[PDB]
Subunit: 239 residues, 4 copies
Amino acid sequence: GFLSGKRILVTGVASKLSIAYGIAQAMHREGAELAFTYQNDKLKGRVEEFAAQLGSDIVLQCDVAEDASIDTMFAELGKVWPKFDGFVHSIGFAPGDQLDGDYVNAVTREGFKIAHDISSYSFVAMAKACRSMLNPGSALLTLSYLGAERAIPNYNVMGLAKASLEANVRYMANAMGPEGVRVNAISAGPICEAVTPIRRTVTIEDVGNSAAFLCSDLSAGISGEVVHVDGGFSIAAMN
Amino acid sequence: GFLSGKRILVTGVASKLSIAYGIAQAMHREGAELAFTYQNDKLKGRVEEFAAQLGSDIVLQCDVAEDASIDTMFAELGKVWPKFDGFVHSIGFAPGDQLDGDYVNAVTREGFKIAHDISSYSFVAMAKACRSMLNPGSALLTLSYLGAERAIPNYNVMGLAKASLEANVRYMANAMGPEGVRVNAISAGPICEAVTPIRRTVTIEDVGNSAAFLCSDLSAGISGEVVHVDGGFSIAAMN
Amino acid sequence: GFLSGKRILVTGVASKLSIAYGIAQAMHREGAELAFTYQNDKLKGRVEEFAAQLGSDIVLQCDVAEDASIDTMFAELGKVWPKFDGFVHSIGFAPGDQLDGDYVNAVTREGFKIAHDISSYSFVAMAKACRSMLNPGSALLTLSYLGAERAIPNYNVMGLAKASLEANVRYMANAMGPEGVRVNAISAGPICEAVTPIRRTVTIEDVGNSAAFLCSDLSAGISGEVVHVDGGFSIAAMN
Amino acid sequence: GFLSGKRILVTGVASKLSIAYGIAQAMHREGAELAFTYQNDKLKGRVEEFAAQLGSDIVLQCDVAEDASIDTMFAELGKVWPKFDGFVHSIGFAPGDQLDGDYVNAVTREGFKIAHDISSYSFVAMAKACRSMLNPGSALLTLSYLGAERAIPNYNVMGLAKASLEANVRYMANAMGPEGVRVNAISAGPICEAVTPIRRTVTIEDVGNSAAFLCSDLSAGISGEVVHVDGGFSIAAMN
Ligand SMILES: NC(=O)C1=CN([C@@H]2O[C@H](COP(=O)(O)OP(=O)(O)OC[C@H]3O[C@@H](n4cnc5c(N)ncnc54)[C@H](O)[C@@H]3O)[C@@H](O)[C@H]2O)C=CC1
Ligand SMILES: NC(=O)C1=CN([C@@H]2O[C@H](COP(=O)(O)OP(=O)(O)OC[C@H]3O[C@@H](n4cnc5c(N)ncnc54)[C@H](O)[C@@H]3O)[C@@H](O)[C@H]2O)C=CC1
Ligand SMILES: NC(=O)C1=CN([C@@H]2O[C@H](COP(=O)(O)OP(=O)(O)OC[C@H]3O[C@@H](n4cnc5c(N)ncnc54)[C@H](O)[C@@H]3O)[C@@H](O)[C@H]2O)C=CC1
Ligand SMILES: NC(=O)C1=CN([C@@H]2O[C@H](COP(=O)(O)OP(=O)(O)OC[C@H]3O[C@@H](n4cnc5c(N)ncnc54)[C@H](O)[C@@H]3O)[C@@H](O)[C@H]2O)C=CC1
Ligand SMILES: CCCCCCc1cc(=O)c(Oc2ccccc2C)cn1C
Ligand SMILES: CCCCCCc1cc(=O)c(Oc2ccccc2C)cn1C
Ligand SMILES: CCCCCCc1cc(=O)c(Oc2ccccc2C)cn1C
Ligand SMILES: CCCCCCc1cc(=O)c(Oc2ccccc2C)cn1C
């Protein structure tokens, strides 16, 4: 398939419902060899069994809050994949008290800090830590949401963190392009269907197929882009 | 390949250099059955020989200046493809005097009219004329340029026509989405490489592979989008 | 006030409810000297009355469909205002059949042509005809709408004409900036409330006050810009 | 003039070259009553002098790194201004090592944290601390830069902090609009010329005059907006 001969690392698999799960299935179907990370002890077993279902046995701990954890993870990866062809960053977090009610009342310096650290900074923390490992032709991908560009109730400081993330995508695409790395995002629709042009919510399958494309040599002409995979929702008003 | 079982009509093939040529080759490689149009008597033979190289013998006249020509073309197409799965609109024109020097001095009411008529209106003229022929799952694609969103010297009234075209993409995606049709554009880089993140100009191959994706079921979650296939050029400043 | 010393031509005053009326009041309040145009002979008496209220006796017929009508009006205006400091373009039209129902069903070649010609081309047609009459520090302003940027039901081909208009603002700003002319648009909110951040619809006073600003030397740093005067409607989602 | 009756707090006046100085002059000229903050004790004497020139005796220490410093300053401001009509946030910082060389090489977790905290979070930290002191009709303003929207060499992690800042403008406008507060940004040009439409770099006077407008009731229709006061630089390409 169109990912044959690519080696891609997939973060963010927590359940069958995760966007990363959908991506990993589409990529496996298209011929990629996959590696997986897991945040913590709680998730390890689930990520192991998914990885085995998709023919992989590279399953490594990584908590992106910690530089040491990211560096250890990539050193472990290096033992099986001394070089590889990019990674999927499918990692977001804000403390729960951030995501309820009026934005100005809910946001705090600490909730802002963590939101941006885990949802935006970690994408470039990963890229720094594996830069010398990426083959020419490599592609990095992260996941954003319309909250980066619109004020959405309750999404609150997560929209600011997604705006920072989308800027990260541009700054990374520019920094890494000369070494043959591309960096993009998918702004996914929520996983309001009567006002979506395609008249349905997007699935992790739709997102997974767009992700596979954006990490493959098919998308060689695309870098620094935030592609809306939301069924046209963001381009409509008042349906 | 990922277009197997799709029937796609390709406009705009004038030479081996055309973007439509690149698209048609990528689509053929991915398994599509193709049909081609040609503007006029001058181009017919070239388009015939390309179509035969790619295993097609559906080659039909269409001048998008004329409603009758578009309607005749689709009636002819209907004899071999009573239904089909969308089309590639790769058609642009402005009179040559429009594209030289200061924009305000060069533009005229007539040059504006023709620019917008041929570069923007014809995309929806086609969609009107074949609406009842499109299978669910169909996808229409047109080609735009950064001139739609930036003032570029000499591109002049063609930037206004491309802005109209990109709006057309949104309005069409919204109108046709409920019948299972998607409508997108690729904003292609020029066919300034030191300030492009990927450090090279895009080719008709890059554009062709993005086009094949956007007309396939892989891109089911994408509609109303203008995807930049320009190597990240539009997202950079001052390199 | 902040338009003292400035001579501005105001098009498109058709009634007390016109946006151009709110604009003309705001500019007169800030001490601009004003002239007015009117489209045809049914509006003549009433624009004369509006102009007199604003201490102006300069009221000239102009149909922006015709190059000869624009040249004549500017030739007349030159008899009183050999030079002047810009104009407000508050002119929009599409045929009524364009603006109701499914976009792809309603739009026609002729309706697209007339919508783009009157609502977009006319702005640059006016610039062309008065370019040599403009002082250093002049400012041109037109009015646009969110339908340039999103698919809105019924607005249909106006949203394309508006997108062409906003690109016209950029190309015009770029062309004329070197000789000391700025060019901007207001994207005005409809003249609903519960999802607009300011929780009220904008008024012609709101718009007029922004228009006065954009035509005055207070906005000397702003050119080629589309300013949204819509109470924040466009930057909100899902309220 | 058009800020008569308004009480506005101005942060970030550090020298006569500061953007906040150009803003404070423009607002004082238009009859606003002003208060000022300063970051630490080296700036104190000189902000006192600038304030006196502008007929103000209200000059309060505030380090926006600390929640306690913001609360104290607003508690002090309340002794003279139990209510007031908004503030200008003209505060930006990243550590010096963040702003030179390859973005992915320079950025660190701590430099990202400090850049977002001081240049983005502080704008909403101030809003939080004075929300109950604001009159109906109040207006908040911050300063951003094109690096929010494009990858600019060296600006590096500031471009992420700025993108977060502009999203903060939208979320804040959306949250506070219902209680009668507007929130906007200026995206200012660098304070080069040959590709800017107006063919000159913008000045703190240009910026100040736009800031005065955005804080006055003349801009009652504008909220959650990023206004580009960069002479049209951002809307041009390839001059
Ligand atoms: N669910 C949706 O509707 C949409 C989600 N997104 C984004 O898609 C991405 C994935 O989301 P989902 O798959 O929906 O939810 P999820 O909860 O299934 O995935 C989130 C993942 O982030 C991981 N994570 C959190 N903090 C981490 C840390 N410190 N170190 C390592 N991993 C960490 C979790 O372990 C989990 O695997 C996120 O960036 C989210 O913002 C974007 C658009 C819409
Ligand atoms: N060449 C480039 O750098 C870029 C081109 N584009 C766009 O890509 C599209 C294709 O361009 P190219 O392949 O470069 O040039 P081309 O000249 O090879 O293709 C233009 C095609 O338009 C056709 N055409 C013109 N008027 C027509 C009419 N009345 N009826 C039917 N067909 C008509 C011509 O026959 C020709 O096949 C155009 O929309 C162009 O604006 C977009 C970005 C960059
Ligand atoms: N009303 C609204 O909610 C919004 C209106 N707009 C735009 O504001 C502008 C003014 O609109 P309105 O003040 O609402 O309505 P209006 O009907 O008062 O003004 C339209 C004006 O255009 C003139 N016009 C039309 N064809 C003309 C021609 N051939 N030659 C010369 N003048 C011609 C009419 O005589 C009239 O003065 C238009 O461009 C419109 O698209 C923008 C955003 C929202
Ligand atoms: N200079 C330029 O070309 C442009 C500047 N900007 C933005 O305009 C704003 C003002 O910048 P400038 O006037 O050029 O330089 P500046 O150096 O005069 O002003 C920066 C101000 O931020 C203050 N500040 C920094 N950390 C602070 C803290 N912890 N607490 C309180 N105050 C703190 C400094 O004391 C100073 O008053 C910044 O947000 C900057 O990013 C935007 C576009 C272009
Ligand atoms: C219908 C209106 C609101 C739409 C929200 C869509 C959406 C966006 C996301 O980023 C997301 O992920 C997170 C969000 C916060 C914290 C952690 C994560 C992983 C989940 N969801 C569901
Ligand atoms: C390097 C600065 C300028 C970049 C221009 C790129 C570019 C854009 C196009 O739309 C294009 O097509 C046309 C343009 C006008 C008329 C007819 C057609 C088919 C060709 N080219 C080459
Ligand atoms: C759902 C649709 C909401 C649109 C409301 C805003 C709106 C936008 C406009 O450009 C407008 O002007 C015209 C429009 C068409 C033809 C002629 C003119 C003068 C009026 N109105 C009301
Ligand atoms: C190629 C780079 C061009 C950038 C020039 C415009 C520019 C943008 C800014 O935000 C700025 O302010 C700061 C920037 C960093 C840290 C602290 C401050 C206060 C200064 N300058 C000059």
